[PDB]
């Protein structure tokens, strides 16, 4: 019974039934940030990243 | 001759079995008396096949219990069914994600009739 | 350069609001998980109530019944009783030891066990069993023996087979019993579907359905066991009862022994099904001889009402979950357009 | 924008990788089709080679009210009997008549006249039901019993070979008849009991057509049917040898004198109940032996062909996902 | 004979392995790279020896891993350490409670130096 | 100063590259001793002793064509003057007598894991170890990759795929190397380590079996200090 | 009930007698194996430069340990310095591998347990090193003190390679898989992994560590792991995508990690790797010594078996005695 409470906690995730889509969302915004650094360099100094 | 055929079929089988997903929430409690009957019930409920290595591992776990006086007592009471399905799914995730096909073809050359452990359940649709 | 910076600002704001909505939908799914667990507990309690308290499951003179069977051993025992060590060793035949509230479940268990595991002549010690029958030097049954001599002296004939069953040699159930129950029944683990739910027709194990004369609830065996965890566990070994036959076949991987339905459906092993016109045995379990029935039915009404309340709450939480998913999709396509216009 | 051009060249490289993967998929398909056609020319060669080349039914037909007599009277003169393998008094044979009557009395005439189906859909085909709960006269077997006049009003059963749980023990190595290596009983001493002359699952001489590749996993009838009719039980010589060996018995025991115990508490007594049907005696003939060896090799070839067909279904399931991913990637690339 | 001596040794080892209790609170997260490294770190944290069959299985999982392109990917990222820790404790419960002595006798008859998998961690 | 410590290694190519920088050059990014800046000068010295002077005086360039542009071999197999850094440094400064490594960012196996979200220095989501009781090891400060403070130019878009400098170079120097307080605390949590560990008192364990002991090393070149 | 308890007590007593019989059997086997090793000891008695390169390095601890080898417990725990344990039949390949591993790991001390590694150093409460350490005072009271750092490897903490050993090869080579190009064909300059090419001494091949491992599965795998030796530099460079972590060229050039290339002149690690001896009959002696080591290992494991059974018989007795008292108080109850 000690195994079930941890396996459900790992099967749920940070966001129940949503978190894969939020990972996709973070990767989409990451692509947007990489493109905006590729176009203009100094904007990195605005975004610290 | 037959060696390259077995290697290519092992590559096909492992590339198929990598992509069959594990179920999301399992809340079942199956009374059982052996490991093979437990895996048959877990195939009939969750309509998914189990890997080649898990079937021979459960046959070895069922064969190691032959010869004792505790052979006749029921495995349901020794090992709790939630604790005995958790180990099936964790061993199955290990057997699907990690191995290679050279090992499996080297296993398959040492026996004819290896399709006794490969099962006809297709989880699509 | 300002359009990329505005796109980053708007995308960060929309991602933060979308993440807060993800926290909300996680909280609703957690409330659904808790409420389905509570519904599981209430349905577990209803199945626990339906063992012997309720006088009638929802359906889709025993001495004369023994004496109709002209040739067996229990007929000879009952005709002697209604008229010396063999009268001292025998506890009593298995049709006489049990009692069941409702006629349907008793008839279908009597069709389950068969009409020779119902006329079994039980014994406390193996010395009684080797006193019931005596043999010749070759291996032939002698007519001047335990059960055959007084049978031929009284007139009736044992001509067919009969079981004998030693309480001392039967492997006793060795599992925790149910605490604070005067009938001393067994907490056999109840099966559960992959939803979390019990099977939809499930009414309980069948060893917990028999009501025993309280002389035999304890100390029958010299190791200090009761009739229920030695005899009736070796006749209904996790045998479980469903309501209809479709409910039994629908929940067939969850069984690990036979199963029995209240329509007539009997299966005894895993792959073996029983089909066709249902056989008729003459011996039936007796009916015990009603305020406990009324208290049980009152508690049944209370449990069904509280279960209905839990179903209404899970439905309301599911509706609010659907609304959260809808607003999630709208905000998602909004900021997807906001990022794709750049 | 040179960075968007580098992005488009990475997209074209991933499109080329998906194209190489999908042509690898159809190459694997064509290899499997050639392998299946080799299997099929071998099986047609074996078909033309084969095409070059007291009674049990009189005892079964006397039990007029069951399904076994119905199927016997039909085969002496549909969609049902495509799945029904046969009544279990006809699938097995033992040499000695006394031990035949012993092993027939052990199982009882309701599980000795039992119609084993190959699959659960056949079990659904044998009996059909109304919405009320009674048996339907337009079901499977009851139509045949009323078309003849055979009256199946007695209860019967149905073994489903796909749903039986098989014996996991290894079979005697390099054996002809594929007997089971069951652990023999041993005393507190090192020796066996004095009356022990083998188990009873190893005593039924099963036909060579049914030894291998009956079930979808490649199992016989001794490993499934005649093991789940009687598991692990011992056969002793006399009754005193049976009583003296109680601390070492398995699931059950029978003796040749006529002593049966089914469970570790139940000791049958009284006069012997008769079962009218019993296993037959095997006959010795070499032409039928050669034809049965040909049929065993035929069944093994059919099983290998069906598993190759399972694998081509599996690789089609992979190539559909390859098609879908390549088409979605093409839509994404042409969209931008 | 030699088989009687090795069968007696197998019965001694199985009677010792049955009594070793599984620890009660097992909340831990150890970063690992292979299965054998997890079993060594898991015996060093929790002062208990793993079974013979568990060391054989935990080796053949890595031998089955060797071939493919996953060998350069970190196994910490494939399978979660709490999930792998729970896997090895469940397999260890099975290997302490369930097996017999004849299986161990045959597996030790097939090869010498079977003590390479049996551990000197006594308590 | 950092550049004086570079010029102390006169036979090394780092002082050659710095002298060319004061007065080949296009492909290179720079040396590792200039890219990383650590506030904790003690922890800076300890990680400097961990890496070794051959790895930390090694130059990093963007492409493999820069690797083929620095040094070129002749038909016999010996290194002559006519290679790029060798001639263009022996024209003015000292020759290359010692070995020097070259690390090219397109050939490294880059980190492929979640990066801590909502972060400026773009830290790495590595699994923090835990004792059997449910707590972290008692002197755990952090993984050593997460200490280096990056010039915000190199955080993104150095790799041709768009990866940064922290997840390619600073992962493939000390991957899952974790920092403790004292050496007895490091020995106490020795089974819970991956690849190595580094204690702030001193003491260096580079592999899971082998571990340094004796004096602490002293090397002159260190990481720079932020302002 | 008493009828359970009487049978339970008599089963416990039969169990205790079984454990005493098992102790007797195991002690008989131990005496037999010790008589065997005494017979092998009298048989073995009946059968009866590299150190200069260590002496070039006065600052490292391996020179101090070489002084003590040529002329307490620190010489008992330490197995031996890395350059003294193995032998390479080539001057070129030995020079290339000794340039590879560095002089710190080529002058490394090698221990049995972590206890010997605690015996090598000492650290006071201030955290500063004094000469009250055993190896430091050992070095200072005979010769010079030790200024260069050294590493001590531990044969129990070394995670061993887990692959089948080449079948019945005397040298116990590793069953490493060779690299494959994406056309399925072997690289042209590939002539072997560097871990199989060391000739290792036959006394240390088998049952060194308490598990029964050699020095190739533990020591020489973890120094350099599955690296590939190629003939020339261009065969190493052209086959860059097929290598694992590690590449070595006889022309000159080492690819440490998959993105790190080594250019420039080469710092000569003046310590080299040794050469195997010419054919001498003393190998016969060494053969006997190999057998002796395995014999000692099995005696060790027999001791663990008896210790194992001793623990079990204590749980056979104590419980029994307690259970015995419980029996009579049940007989004192009614």
Author numbering:
A (entry chain G): 45 to 93
B (entry chain B): 39 to 163
C (entry chain F): 43 to 102, 117 to 139, 147 to 352, 357 to 409
D (entry chain E): 46 to 98, 116 to 139, 147 to 405
E (entry chain A): 39 to 161
F (entry chain D): 117 to 139, 149 to 352
G (entry chain C): 52 to 99, 117 to 139, 147 to 409
From the manuscript:
RdDM requires two plant-specific RNA polymerases known as RNA polymerase IV (Pol IV) and RNA polymerase V (Pol V), and a number of accessory proteins with different functions. All together, these observations have positioned the DDR complex as a key component that acts downstream of the methylation readers SUVH2/SUVH9 to recruit Pol V to RdDM loci. We report here the structures of the Arabidopsis Pol V recruitment complexes DR (DMS3-RDM1) and DDR′ (DRD1 peptide 7-DMS3-RDM1). The structures of the two complexes are similar at their core—two DMS3 dimers bridged by an RDM1 dimer.
When co-expressed in E. coli, DMS3, RDM1, and DRD1 peptide 7 formed a stable and isolatable complex that we called the DDR′ complex. Using single-particle cryoEM, we determined the structure of the DDR′ complex to an overall resolution of 3.5 Å. First, DRD1 peptide 7 forms three helices (α1, α2, and α3) and binds to DMS3-RDM1 in the DDR′ complex. Helix α1 is threaded into a symmetric, hydrophobic cleft formed by the RDM1 dimer interface involving the residues Lys121 and Leu128 (inset 1). On the other hand, α2 engages in hydrophobic interactions with two CC arms and one hinge from three DMS3 molecules, while α3 interacts with one CC arm and one hinge from two DMS3 molecules (inset 2). We attempted to model another DRD1 peptide 7 with the same interactions into the complex, however, this resulted in steric clashes between the two α1 helices. Therefore, the DDR′ complex most likely contains only one molecule of the peptide. A second major difference between the DR and DDR′ complexes is that the disordered CC arm of one DMS3h in the DR complex became ordered and visible in the DDR′ complex (i.e., the CC in DMS3hc2). Combined with the two DMS3 states already seen in the DR complex, we have three different DMS3 states (DMS3h, DMS3hc1 and DMS3hc2) in the DDR′ complex. The newly ordered CC arm is positioned close to the CC arm of DMS3hc1 from the same DMS3 dimer (DMS3hc1(E)-DMS3hc2(F)) in the DDR′ complex in a state that we refer as a “closed” state, and thus the corresponding DMS3 dimer which has a flexible CC arm in the DR complex is referred as an “open” state.
